[PDB]
Design a protein around this ligand. Structure first.
Ligand SMILES: CC(=O)N[C@H]1CN2CC[C@H](O)[C@@H]2[C@@H](O)[C@@H]1O
Length: 494
């Protein structure tokens, strides 16, 4: 075997300087970490990845021989970057914080042969190409969304999806935990939302919800994968589950039935009833107590049954509730037309046919200093069909093949918005049509690593013809990990 080339990694690393003979992990290699819990956690994570396929003991130690060295040190790598040095003497990953060590490990696993992901002992050799990678991200907002409201996904399925996104240096997990078809978090001040509002899902299945303990475990697990959880309570539209659970929240005071279909636009909270804000205050307060992350997403899309002036007055009242609990507002880009507060981010989900006036409104807010998360429906929506023949997913945004999802520049995308306003990107996975985790993987892969690269990699590394060869190189690893994926004909799979 020869080593996988040092640059064959997604995201493309910011700097790659290949040179010298490779490191070879052998029966005597140790994983040497600084003397601390933060250090041992990353070392034990790495050992868990490497022990099954190598069959080596790979002790995590703070003394002795090393071979794979994980070290924290001051340096120019910021909060999330790292340097990886590899040669005959060993592999050393250096960073300022545990998050850059963890990022360096996600790089190290792609450098290693695909057999590394197997769950039993495999022949070597275990080669890491020689040279130096120095790597820091282009954008700080690099996120993946999972809709657990349309179809429910369990704590264990969400942890499996966290492990998918952690491969590619995503650092935010947006969980869409409420919509018309379900409410997915126990709220003590409004107990019916989860108990009744969570009792079904699209298609009339058993639905589900996270207890407070379940939600804490999802947050703790994602943190151990350096993902900051960004929960969304969508409002004032996409609220049927909440309205069905509490008659008083409805303008007419009558609870609609639980909804199991896939239409949108029809539900609204009652903007002129004060009890609506008792409900928002209580839910956001309880969600904030469970959210160590900095952001609360209040949604704001498809409020088609809410008059514009009511939508504006609603967001005027609700956004300060987020600041009252010490968090920052994120909304879908409809919020740009309703006075985003200072610090608020908007998430653009539009597409090429979105009207010019609507695009100009979002760009106006960006010029006004509103930060922008880009997730265009005809680029990074992972539920969008690849072609007319994809058996799952939607096509309201057109067909989105692998090249189209990758081949754009978040810095030069929305006309009239400054580059400086772009906080980063997100890849959302909506679940109207997806009800099991193998289906999630088929729709998420192979576009998911592409959005991760847009978030992470320098613009100077961006290039379809050479990226598609790095993407083809992931397939053997996916196959060893058991990850289903769409074998696009645009990619030169080996
Ligand atoms: C933010 C967002 O994409 N909202 C809705 C946007 N709509 C547009 C058409 C679909 O119903 C789609 C739906 O799946 C999504 O939930």
């Amino acid at each position: 075997a020869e080593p996988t080339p040092l640059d064959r990694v997604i995201p493309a690393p910011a700097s790659v300087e290949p040179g010298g003979a490779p490191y070879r992990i052998t029966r005597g290699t140790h994983i040497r970490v600084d003397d601390s819990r933060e250090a041992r956690r990353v070392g034990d994570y790495l050992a868990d990845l490497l022990r099954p396929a190598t069959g080596y003991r790979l002790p995590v130690t703070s003394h002795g021989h090393g071979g794979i060295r994980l070290r924290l040190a001051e340096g120019p790598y910021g909060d999330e970057g790292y340097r990886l040095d590899s040669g005959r003497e060993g592999v050393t990953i250096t960073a300022r914080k545990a998050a850059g060590l963890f990022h360096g490990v996600q790089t190290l696993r792609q450098l290693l042969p695909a057999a590394v992901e197997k769950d039993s002992a495999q022949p070597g050799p275990w080669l890491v190409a020689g040279g130096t990678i120095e790597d820091t991200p282009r954008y700080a907002w690099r996120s993946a969304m999972l809709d657990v409201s349309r179809h429910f996904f369990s704590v264990d399925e969400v942890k499996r999806y966290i492990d998918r996104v952690a491969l590619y240096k995503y650092n935010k997990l947006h969980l869409h935990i409420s919509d018309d078809q379900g409410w997915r978090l126990a709220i003590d001040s409004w107990p019916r939302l989860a108990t009744y509002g969570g009792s079904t899902e699209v298609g009339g299945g058993p639905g589900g919800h996270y207890t407070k303990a379940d939600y804490e475990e999802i947050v703790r697990y994602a943190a151990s994968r350096h993902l900051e959880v960004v929960p969304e309570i969508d409002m004032p539209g996409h609220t049927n589950a909440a309205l069905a659970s509490y008659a008083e929240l409805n303008c007419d005071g009558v609870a609609p039935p639980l909804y199991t279909g896939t239409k949108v636009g029809f539900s609204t909270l009652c903007v002129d009833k004060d009890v609506t804000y008792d409900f928002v205050d209580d839910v956001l307060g309880e969600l904030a107590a469970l959210t160590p992350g900095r952001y609360l997403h209040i949604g704001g899309d498809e409020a088609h049954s809410t008059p514009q002036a009511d939508f504006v007055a609603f967001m005027k009242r609700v956004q300060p509730i987020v600041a009252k609990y010490g968090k920052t507002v994120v909304g879908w880009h409809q919020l740009a037309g309703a006075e985003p507060v200072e610090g608020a981010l908007v998430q653009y989900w539009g597409l090429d046919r979105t009207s010019d006036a609507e695009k100009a409104q979002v760009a106006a807010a960006a010029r006004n200093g509103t930060g922008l998360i880009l997730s265009p429906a005809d680029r990074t929506y992972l539920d969008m069909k690849y072609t007319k023949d994809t058996p799952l997913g939607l096509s309201w945004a057109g067909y989105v093949e692998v090249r189209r999802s990758y081949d754009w520049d978040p810095a030069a995308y929305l006309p009239g918005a400054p580059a400086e306003a772009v906080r980063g990107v997100e890849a959302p996975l909506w679940t109207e049509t997806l009800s099991d985790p193998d289906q999630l993987d088929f729709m998420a892969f192979p576009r998911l690593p592409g959005v991760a690269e847009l978030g992470w990699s320098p613009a100077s590394t961006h290039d379809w013809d050479t990226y598609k060869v790095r993407l083809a190189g992931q397939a053997p690893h996916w196959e060893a990990m058991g990850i289903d994926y769409y074998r696009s004909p645009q990619v030169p799979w080996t």
